[PDB]
Symmetry: C4
Subunit: 318 residues, 4 copies
């Protein structure tokens, strides 16, 4: 777990129509950062805000002895794209991500900085006081189950964006080819050592959440497609089940009619429907056959590392 | 909006079986360009013309003190491919695109040059006197709706090829991997600042329009495929609707028959048809599942920028 | 048509289980090449022959003052792959391709060399005395129709491998990414100027043709897939036709039953079948929608030139 | 078959939850390697073992005068990925692969080393005493049939991982783009000369086999997808068969009804079902049409060599 000590830190905050909370956010974040006794930097990214957020950001950047860098984008690209834009400019050894709605307490930064200074590459967080509602709860349960099945371990909370990373992870991720990503998952791919911290949560003080239904469906699709290619494998299973059922039912119908003779007027249509079901299952099998190669192409185009080494131990003589 | 002043301009005109209009076009364009009081250049591209257009082009290029460069292609590749070929040779700071049928008045060039000299990267145009016909009007309405939904702003008129660009945009676009493109849309992807101008329109004086039905369907397909990958997402919605309807209808049939007893001779076939509809919906869901990964692969292969920066504002101390 | 004069020539002959014809082939080819009065070279490629062809090839290469180079492959890759292997070693300015079964008269080489020396990049050939049989004739007719529709001109005869190319074409083709190709078509993509020559044809003197039914189906698939992506567009047309027919038939059934009342006992099943046909057509439309993006990806991965320039004509002052 | 003599050898052993067999394995492998009278090296790779295997590996590496290198991975990637990780560090001229369960006798190493020293690039092995059970036997029969059909020769036994390779093969394979591979097959792609050796087999002394049902299905899929793209071609054949059958049956029904008049009450539904079957076959044809291009894209993205040269024989004068 040994690592070089941290001497500078950077903070990345995506902003999108959050003029109401920005004034308090700036003061609280500045106080928290100054409480570290460490060199600090702040970067604010405007994801195509329609309100006056950009004006406040530039005004803050123009204040005397200001440590705030303002970055403007020509349109709305998304939260993670803005985070990548922020990463492209950071100069500190440790990177902190934070939300602009102020639901994440800025006062938790020093704990993350300390734990990362112990030597850990990636430090996560878990919301001890987490709202419970059937939709979010079920989604989180299924998503965490899939994540632990795939990665081999559970990360506690994936939806919390209050996290810390070291610069090498940022440099590694920034060179990836894939255009769409989920930063918390993509970070664990290159992490040699990880930990977590409990933190408390609060509701947004002003405005409304920007994640609508479609903007949430897109996020779910991105997450699932970034995790695994497994869904392409269930089509063949479903087709096999349907085909076996149809074939067995047709054979049983033939045997029953031969043994007992005619029974109903609509017997022939039933046999034809059974054959139709068998063909429909064969169609699912074919689609899964296509999906296998499609997934292979996707993985090859992605060009992720084929393996990751945790450490190498040579003897006294190489 | 500050930018370096313009000192040279270049004009690109695709030619394809337009011998009738070329003589007048050359004179009018030369007069318009000379009215600028600016260094000017003209490039004519032959997109595999079958008539004598190439002979007229070479003769014009061979005239004394001629500023016309003639470029010949071994076959018909298309309008935008010819425009790219022209861009590959331009030397001026500002680039002007114009049609050879002379429907676009060459006299509007100085206005575009002046407005671009103000500092704007991309200057468009809008046809104030635009022909109205149900086909074109509906197509334009739907296309503009989709464009404003995707890009976030409307461009006024996409079908008008009388436009201006600065050289950096040309260099950026010329290095893109994609083989098929729509220049007006691809230009806005890299534009930091854009404007528009009203202009008048006229019908072609000679000949007939070269865009047939199939040559228009191909253009529509290219435009839609260059805009977005959304169409791959509607298949799953349609499948979900069909499957839900079929399942509900089958359950209702079972409940009704149990409550009221037999009602019709053809009841079983109705249940079988309901099951068939459910499976057919599942098939659409599977095809959409494939489409998600196909779109991901397409975007990754394209390799467009993940974000574009409008400007960065550091404090007095970096 | 001006070009540098030719001073050396090279000949490429694929060999695959042709020991019977090789002795006569070597003598006739040597005589023909020596009749040119030009520096000449010969390359023989063994495509994994099971007979003693390799032994004869090496023996010929080991003869005193022999101009024959023998190349052996670890397995059977195909005719065009062997031709590419030959191209990878040629040193002459002009390249000649010839078959090993001796159906192509070696005595026609000097005519090709002379015509190429006139300046033409690519010289083809046409079989004046061509066997007629329904299978081959219909296949050639349809293939030539498609080729002339796509490329814009007809090449006369595509199945004749007796052809000539200049070295720059070979170098251009050899750097293409695509693993499967049809050399005659891929050559015309980069040819600035082409011509043809009539030649006579004969049946193979010994052995049997190596192209079986499956080995011919694979060749047809390679040719069609190298030509165009159009076949992916007919699925949507077929689906549209089927859906329109089904919808019209269902509406007509409803109208007729309302106007005239009940007519048959099996009316409901007919309506259900009409709805089923409509959905089946929608499925074809969806598959074509997928095919559009698949073809786009294929073209982008291929990375062929976006345009080819025949010549550029600057004025007296650049 | 001439090749440089071997002076150093390396051994690669994947380890995954095999603490029970590791102590005996280390001693037996050390004795076998020391019996060669040749410079030797050993590399142990931990594929994310949950038991104490890593502790034993590091302890062995820390022993005085130890020739064992221990490599740890952050998670379970697979057997072949671990073998690739081992290959990334080997320094010897010849590479030996061995299993950790000790079913492969380590005493067979010197025979492989000697035969490879004769000059062969790749040396395989065949299990003379092989367990027979319907599942494994049928799978091996079909797999070997497909392998010999594709590659042109049979390898004897593909499931035996006790094999030897020279360093150039390792370097060639290590630069391949494909993320998923089957090492024995991928090795033969670049092998100029290969041989085999009989060896005896034994059951694992401790623990249980780690290859479950799903972990075996994934391996079968990887093997088949690495071999060939043929499965995408059978869909069109099946569709053609179904469509021809349906069309013939419908025509026969029409002819029979016209000749003999009405015969059954359910005649119309039979004709409709025949039409439905024809359309279903057309759907398979379309899916195969898509599969052709998908396979082309897969092969192009893979970027394997278009041909491999066994040897070149120039005359006395080049
Ligand atoms: O398109 C978007 C949506 C959100 N955000 C930012 O992401 C954070 C999450 O805000 P939101 O309230 O939507 O998320 P919630 O906490 O309600 O889940 C905020 O800083 C937003 O400004 C953004 O930059 N772009
Ligand atoms: O394959 C084509 C079709 C058109 N054009 C050029 O594109 C412009 C548009 O001409 P057209 O009359 O077809 O378009 P319209 O103005 O009628 O929409 C003209 O300069 C044509 O010469 C071209 O270069 N290649
Ligand atoms: O897999 C193959 C098949 C053919 N050929 C060569 O291609 C030419 C064509 O021979 P074939 O008689 O099969 O073609 P045909 O003239 O009958 O169409 C001959 O030189 C063959 O040796 C080859 O190199 N590899
Ligand atoms: O995910 C896996 C599965 C197996 N193995 C190793 O591969 C070899 C094969 O072991 P197993 O007993 O599963 O194969 P079997 O010989 O029973 O077919 C052993 O050295 C395992 O440690 C591995 O490294 N990773
Ligand atoms: Mn919020
Ligand atoms: Mn026009
Ligand atoms: Mn022949
Ligand atoms: Mn075992």
């Amino acid at each position: 777990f040994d690592a070089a000590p941290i001497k500078k830190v950077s903070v990345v905050i995506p902003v999108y129509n959050e003029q109401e909370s920005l004034p308090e956010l700036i003061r609280r974040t500045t106080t928290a950062c100054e409480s570290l006794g460490k060199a600090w930097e702040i970067l604010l990214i405007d994801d195509g805000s329609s309100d006056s957020s950009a004006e406040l950001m530039v005004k803050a950047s123009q204040e005397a002895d200001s440590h705030i860098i303002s970055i403007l984008l020509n349109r709305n690209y998304g939260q993670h794209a803005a985070i990548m834009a922020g990463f492209s400019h950071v100069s500190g050894d440790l990177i902190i991500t934070l939300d602009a709605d102020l639901q994440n307490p800025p006062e938790e930064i020093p704990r993350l900085v300390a734990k990362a200074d112990e030597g850990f590459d990636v430090v996560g967080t878990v919301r001890q006081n987490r709202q419970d509602s059937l939709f979010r709860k079920s989604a989180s349960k299924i998503i965490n189950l899939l994540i632990q099945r795939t990665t081999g371990k559970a990360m506690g909370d994936y939806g919390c964006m209050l996290r810390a990373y070291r610069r090498p992870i940022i440099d590694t991720m920034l060179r990836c080819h894939e255009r769409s990503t989920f930063i918390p998952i993509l970070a664990n791919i290159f992490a040699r050592r990880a930990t977590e911290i409990p933190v408390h949560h609060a509701e947004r003080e002003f405005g409304d959440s920007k994640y609508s239904f479609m903007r949430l469906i897109n996020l779910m699709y991105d997450l699932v497609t970034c995790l695994t290619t497994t869904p392409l494998r269930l089509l063949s299973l479903l087709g096999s089940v349907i085909a076996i059922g149809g074939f067995s039912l047709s054979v049983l119908l033939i045997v029953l009619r031969l043994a007992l003779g005619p029974q109903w007027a609509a017997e022939g249509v039933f046999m034809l429907f059974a054959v139709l079901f068998t063909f429909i299952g064969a169609q699912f099998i074919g689609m899964g056959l296509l999906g296998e190669y499609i997934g292979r192409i996707y993985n090859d185009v992605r060009a992720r590392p084929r393996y990751f080494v945790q450490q190498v131990i040579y003897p006294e003589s190489t």
